[PDB]
Amino acid sequence: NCLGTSNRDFVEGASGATWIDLVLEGGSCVTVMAPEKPTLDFKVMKMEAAELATVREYCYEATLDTLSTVARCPTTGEAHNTKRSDPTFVCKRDVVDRGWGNGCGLFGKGSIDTCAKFTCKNKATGKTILRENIKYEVAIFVHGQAARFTISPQAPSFTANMGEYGTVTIDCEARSGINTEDYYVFTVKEKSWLVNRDWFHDLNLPWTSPATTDWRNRETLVEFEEPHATKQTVVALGSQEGALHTALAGAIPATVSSSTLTLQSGHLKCRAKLDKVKIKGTTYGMCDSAFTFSKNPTDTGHGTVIVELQYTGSNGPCRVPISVTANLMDLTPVGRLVTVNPFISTGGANNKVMIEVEPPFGDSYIVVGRGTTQINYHWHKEGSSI
Amino acid sequence: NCLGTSNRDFVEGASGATWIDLVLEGGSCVTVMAPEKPTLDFKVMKMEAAELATVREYCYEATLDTLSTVARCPTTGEAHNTKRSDPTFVCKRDVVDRGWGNGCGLFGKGSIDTCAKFTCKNKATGKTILRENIKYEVAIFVHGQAARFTISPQAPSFTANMGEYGTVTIDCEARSGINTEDYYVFTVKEKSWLVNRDWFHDLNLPWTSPATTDWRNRETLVEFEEPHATKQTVVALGSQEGALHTALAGAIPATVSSSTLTLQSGHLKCRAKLDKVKIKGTTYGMCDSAFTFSKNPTDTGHGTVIVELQYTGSNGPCRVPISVTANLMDLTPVGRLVTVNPFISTGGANNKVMIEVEPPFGDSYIVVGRGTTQINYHWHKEGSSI
Amino acid sequence: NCLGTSNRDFVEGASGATWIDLVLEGGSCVTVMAPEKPTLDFKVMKMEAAELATVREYCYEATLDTLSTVARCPTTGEAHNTKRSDPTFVCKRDVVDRGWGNGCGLFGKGSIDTCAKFTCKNKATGKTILRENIKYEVAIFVHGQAARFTISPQAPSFTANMGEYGTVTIDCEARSGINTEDYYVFTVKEKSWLVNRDWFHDLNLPWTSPATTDWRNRETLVEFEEPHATKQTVVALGSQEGALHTALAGAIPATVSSSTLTLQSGHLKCRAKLDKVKIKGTTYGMCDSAFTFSKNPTDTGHGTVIVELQYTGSNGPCRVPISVTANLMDLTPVGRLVTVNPFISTGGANNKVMIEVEPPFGDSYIVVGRGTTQINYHWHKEGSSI
């Protein structure tokens, strides 16, 4: 199940402590065993954001209610609607052709005024991610039940007695993956994505704040059509739900339940501190067989590529030789691997793995394995554009 | 005074160097001694932000000065005040009932125009925290005076010769506590708090910039009352100081002097690099006695709980067994400790400690000690809401 | 060429691994050799930002095109220009003196309306820096060709077989220097600087978005002069290029080519993981000679000082004794060094080095060397002010 720890990942001092680096990814786990000591399976479980705070609320499907139009004959100054006293009504002062047929003195421009009640049927919510909202749950399995603990960015360390290992301090910080700072959690009544903060602000839709409950910038979903002497019909523009869904293609969708817990991606770099202890360092070989694409490589909103492979061999457990090259005539590592340890669990028949890499901008080949039987994939990465 | 270093916190290689992790918190200090080597007390002192830059200046107590109202008879177009040429005056064009009693031709709507001088008596200042503003001062005591140095996020490392230890490189970065990015330093002439950046922007008060000295969005502290044919009395709204103080309940207050140095919270993780040297590793036991609440546990603006305890025993120096559980029937660590090392200095009679923890959202119990004589505290943490 | 590794920078466990800390700066490199093992020169090369996304586009040199003015006699309501139907035209309704000479009934205020086509000749571009845009290229030289690799914040680790050293994992994260979060890349058709995000938003110039192609806030580069009964001449304000260049003095200029790759500053902290291996630890002495200023110490936009020195001696390779003190009577390190390892490469005659330090705010002396023949420099650092 869990892949053993390697020699490079731990240092036993001649006197003092034995420090061991743990790379806890959502995919696989790292197990650490020691002579005359119980084996410890280190598996991360929940990378979440407990509770979020709302920043803004844009409206895409607005509905106009009560209308009222007051007009006055030309050469009599201006027209004034008595709904402007209430800031919850959007109004517009215009001019119309006037004559004897409508009931006025001179054939001129008669000033009018038309107000309408602005309400919002369906709205979208934008939420922010703060440091006191992030939690990480790590499970530890023992052989020879389990013991679980949690760590936050405010409390990254955890000390606990683990039997024959004595007191153990586990200091873990979060790395790689997404950058929670430059992102907002966009929420439609159905799904939820992650958008850029500047992309969120720069949006010409009627919005409201938890501090300012009254809607602002409403003059973008309302349309004042051709005015008449009596009634100037103003209508509510169509639902902008389609436009948003069209604008949210390259946005990365995060799983959000009713408790607003945000399941995210990335990895967790942890270091375990123990008393002086010798540890078995297992070293895994290379996969000499051939891999095949389980499906088409997807793409997340942070310029990384998720690729699901399936190994056709029994040399497990081994290390996947995946690299992103420039051309088929170059084995030059012009790409990078987000997944630090791309090992296969067991060697039982046909298994599958979940690897994530960062290819350079432009044309690049995702190549797995070598020799005569290797496969590749032409990938074109787009530049940054909100 | 200072608590000794533990076995886990240092690794002496068979050849090369001896690395030791130092967890420097504002509360206690970490002392490191070695055979035939002088003892070294590592104590952090100043976690500050030297100088800050102002971003905006909101006005809450505005004062209106010179008023002027120009009106014209109905059916004569519009009214135009000659103060609109000066952008430092807020104006409003309205209409009033007019007749023969006031001195006009027809009984209609006479257009008027009323301007007023806008000035700001008392204002609040919002300042930002940049990386070149943060400084950390660390003191080192020797036994057998002292040596002090400073580190910034731009210069986290410090190398200096320390006698028998030879050249010593101390590499320290800041962790946990607050996130200085998503916060602004709000400043009233009296106190100073820390607010969210989005909470700062989304504020409907007249504001000015160091770049734009002229006040903008002033039409929110002015009130145009019922207009008359001669003078339309417009007044300045009451002081919004009370509203701000009401809106700044859950905001964390930071100590700021006239030099704008911001005393903050969190901890400093440092690693000392020395030549190969053996170090005495002192291990402290558990507190078997009973703790009592010195006072009621407070709360900071970053979802953490400060709790002041007092130990009724003489087993010092020992480690405080404080944990945040879900229920009284569960000893499950559902909470976390921001304070990494919650040790007691000496064992002399009744001493006090300063522990800070991060409880999960909702109901949670803060439990100290075990056995028959332990105490707890029901705590309800609120969700994130600017 | 490269300075050897020091004893403090590596720990060889009695069993397991040998970890070595590498401080890779743009200036010098760190070479690590081992008995019966080939020497390895670790040199960083490219600290860049591959591709950037545009956020806003301000206009400083606008040009007005087609003008049109429609006026109507007084006591006839208002005037209405038929260009307001097109939102690409900026308009203004004003009043003028009217009489029999111009062709009207009564000597009163005749309402007019003047519109003009708003276009932008030259514009400035503001771009943002995201995590998927940052890349770091590191070169490794071997003696007894070279092997190069890349690392991103999403993929900071790199594992590769290096002959007799076996599998080697190099885990590197970025530290110090600039903070890419609070900065935007300002781009004029000529040069490119780095400005603050709040300084970018708070700017009263006509701006456009990649989402909103139509220009907004144009009423700041247009000037409506004294109006006449026929034509109200409105002109385009002069080029604001001079004002921007005046406002961009303390802004740090980054090298940007046509591929928008941003050459930046700071340093890269890396740790190499290898199997158990003994490493030669070379220790360098102190420079007893005298240094001289090659040129006047410059200043970057992040409150650090670049100083170029030249060593007049042959004691190389040695360590430069540069420190920032308060007064000439105090050797107190009140300043800090951004450059971690300020060593000199060879000792051949007169060589030059590139040191960067962070002096405290206010008066401070940059002192190099000691004894009778040392030199200093009075430096006054300004406070933070956008």
XYZ file of all heavy atoms in Angstrom, chain A residues 16-50:
258
model
N 22.328 12.582 19.332
C 21.255 13.554 19.269
C 19.960 12.996 18.713
O 19.242 12.268 19.397
N 19.664 13.335 17.463
C 18.375 12.992 16.875
C 18.486 12.344 15.505
O 19.545 12.339 14.879
C 17.501 14.227 16.789
N 17.364 11.798 15.050
C 17.248 11.249 13.709
C 16.120 11.964 12.981
O 14.945 11.747 13.273
C 16.946 9.743 13.738
O 18.068 9.041 14.285
C 16.672 9.228 12.334
N 16.486 12.827 12.040
C 15.504 13.587 11.279
C 15.181 12.884 9.971
O 16.077 12.405 9.279
C 16.028 14.993 10.994
C 16.226 15.821 12.221
C 15.898 15.483 13.500
C 16.798 17.130 12.286
N 16.232 16.501 14.359
C 16.785 17.525 13.637
C 17.320 18.008 11.334
C 17.275 18.758 14.057
C 17.804 19.229 11.752
C 17.779 19.593 13.102
N 13.898 12.826 9.634
C 13.467 12.182 8.400
C 12.442 13.036 7.654
O 11.432 13.450 8.224
C 12.917 10.759 8.664
C 12.200 10.215 7.426
C 11.994 10.746 9.871
C 11.596 8.841 7.629
N 12.718 13.313 6.382
C 11.821 14.119 5.558
C 10.690 13.282 4.971
O 10.927 12.241 4.358
C 12.590 14.828 4.437
C 13.214 16.138 4.889
O 12.646 16.790 5.790
O 14.270 16.519 4.341
N 9.460 13.746 5.165
C 8.285 13.055 4.647
C 7.578 13.903 3.598
O 7.136 15.017 3.881
C 7.312 12.729 5.782
C 7.823 11.781 6.866
C 6.789 11.619 7.971
C 8.181 10.436 6.260
N 7.476 13.373 2.385
C 6.750 14.048 1.319
C 5.354 13.449 1.201
O 5.151 12.453 0.507
C 7.477 13.920 -0.027
C 6.806 14.796 -1.073
C 8.941 14.298 0.129
N 4.398 14.060 1.893
C 3.034 13.543 1.938
C 2.169 14.139 0.835
O 1.761 15.297 0.910
C 2.399 13.815 3.305
C 3.155 13.307 4.534
C 2.408 13.678 5.802
C 3.372 11.805 4.460
N 1.896 13.340 -0.191
C 1.008 13.754 -1.271
C -0.339 13.062 -1.122
O -0.448 12.047 -0.436
C 1.620 13.422 -2.631
C 2.900 14.178 -2.937
C 3.581 13.681 -4.196
O 3.133 12.652 -4.743
O 4.563 14.315 -4.638
N -1.359 13.612 -1.770
C -2.697 13.057 -1.692
C -2.792 11.657 -2.269
O -3.633 10.860 -1.852
N -1.920 11.358 -3.227
C -1.930 10.069 -3.893
C -1.420 8.934 -3.024
O -2.203 8.178 -2.450
N -0.101 8.814 -2.930
C 0.512 7.738 -2.161
C 0.896 8.185 -0.755
O 0.703 9.342 -0.380
C 1.741 7.189 -2.891
O 1.378 6.599 -4.128
N 1.438 7.252 0.019
C 1.866 7.533 1.381
C 3.307 7.082 1.572
O 3.845 6.336 0.753
C 0.971 6.806 2.380
S 1.197 5.015 2.389
N 3.925 7.531 2.658
C 5.294 7.146 2.967
C 5.350 6.366 4.273
O 4.980 6.880 5.328
C 6.212 8.374 3.077
C 7.612 7.951 3.493
C 6.244 9.132 1.758
N 5.809 5.122 4.197
C 5.951 4.290 5.386
C 7.399 4.238 5.863
O 8.323 4.095 5.063
C 5.424 2.858 5.154
O 5.836 2.015 6.236
C 5.957 2.291 3.851
N 7.588 4.366 7.172
C 8.923 4.327 7.758
C 9.035 3.251 8.836
O 8.340 3.292 9.852
C 9.333 5.696 8.337
C 8.180 6.327 9.097
C 10.558 5.552 9.228
N 9.915 2.284 8.601
C 10.124 1.196 9.545
C 11.535 1.246 10.109
O 12.435 1.827 9.504
C 9.881 -0.152 8.867
C 10.795 -0.418 7.684
S 10.335 -2.056 6.735
C 8.507 -1.601 6.231
N 11.722 0.633 11.271
C 13.023 0.607 11.922
C 13.213 -0.721 12.641
O 12.238 -1.322 13.096
C 13.148 1.771 12.896
N 14.467 -1.193 12.730
C 14.797 -2.450 13.413
C 14.276 -2.477 14.847
O 14.544 -1.550 15.612
C 16.326 -2.452 13.409
C 16.689 -1.671 12.201
C 15.653 -0.589 12.096
N 13.535 -3.529 15.186
C 12.929 -3.680 16.507
C 12.015 -2.506 16.853
O 11.857 -2.147 18.019
C 14.004 -3.886 17.581
C 14.794 -5.177 17.408
C 16.020 -5.242 18.296
O 16.424 -4.188 18.832
O 16.580 -6.348 18.457
N 11.421 -1.912 15.820
C 10.469 -0.817 15.974
C 9.293 -1.045 15.030
O 9.482 -1.498 13.901
C 11.130 0.524 15.646
C 12.340 0.879 16.498
C 11.952 1.163 17.939
C 13.095 1.828 18.692
N 14.353 1.037 18.608
N 8.072 -0.726 15.486
C 6.871 -0.925 14.663
C 6.868 -0.026 13.429
O 7.358 1.100 13.489
C 5.732 -0.533 15.608
C 6.358 0.380 16.600
C 7.753 -0.131 16.794
N 6.325 -0.527 12.322
C 6.269 0.243 11.084
C 5.226 1.351 11.191
O 4.175 1.169 11.806
C 5.941 -0.651 9.870
O 4.575 -1.077 9.938
C 6.853 -1.871 9.842
N 5.522 2.500 10.589
C 4.624 3.650 10.642
C 4.237 4.134 9.249
O 5.082 4.621 8.498
C 5.275 4.799 11.414
C 5.572 4.558 12.893
C 6.304 5.750 13.486
C 4.288 4.284 13.657
N 2.959 4.009 8.908
C 2.466 4.486 7.621
C 1.990 5.929 7.734
O 0.992 6.209 8.398
C 1.324 3.603 7.113
C 1.720 2.143 6.988
O 2.933 1.856 6.917
O 0.817 1.281 6.955
N 2.706 6.844 7.087
C 2.325 8.252 7.095
C 1.496 8.621 5.874
O 2.012 8.710 4.762
C 3.557 9.150 7.180
C 4.130 9.253 8.559
C 5.129 8.392 8.973
C 3.667 10.210 9.444
C 5.658 8.484 10.243
C 4.193 10.307 10.712
C 5.189 9.443 11.114
N 0.207 8.842 6.097
C -0.718 9.152 5.019
C -1.501 10.421 5.329
O -2.167 10.515 6.359
C -1.681 7.982 4.804
C -2.800 8.253 3.811
C -2.266 8.397 2.398
C -3.395 8.570 1.398
N -2.888 8.668 0.003
N -1.407 11.402 4.437
C -2.207 12.612 4.559
C -3.626 12.288 4.103
O -3.834 11.374 3.305
C -1.616 13.771 3.724
C -1.897 13.568 2.243
C -2.165 15.106 4.197
N -4.607 13.016 4.622
C -5.998 12.718 4.304
C -6.790 13.923 3.812
O -7.279 13.930 2.681
C -6.701 12.080 5.504
C -6.238 10.666 5.817
S -7.302 9.851 7.231
C -9.055 9.945 6.381
N -6.920 14.940 4.657
C -7.771 16.078 4.327
C -7.006 17.390 4.173
O -6.508 17.950 5.149
C -8.880 16.234 5.371
C -9.704 14.973 5.590
C -10.917 15.246 6.464
C -11.880 16.200 5.779
N -13.058 16.509 6.633
N -6.918 17.870 2.937
C -6.371 19.192 2.659
C -7.526 20.135 2.343
O -7.970 20.223 1.199
C -5.393 19.138 1.484
C -4.197 18.227 1.709
S -2.912 18.282 0.241
C -2.361 20.148 0.378
N -8.012 20.838 3.362
C -9.256 21.589 3.234
C -9.186 23.027 3.741
O -8.204 23.440 4.354
C -10.374 20.853 3.974
C -10.153 20.767 5.477
C -11.331 20.153 6.208
O -12.132 19.444 5.561
O -11.458 20.381 7.430
N -10.248 23.779 3.472
C -10.431 25.112 4.032
C -11.766 25.150 4.769
O -12.823 25.243 4.147
C -10.402 26.153 2.938
N -11.699 25.078 6.095
C -12.869 24.851 6.948
C -14.055 25.772 6.667
O -15.132 25.312 6.288
C -12.473 24.933 8.415
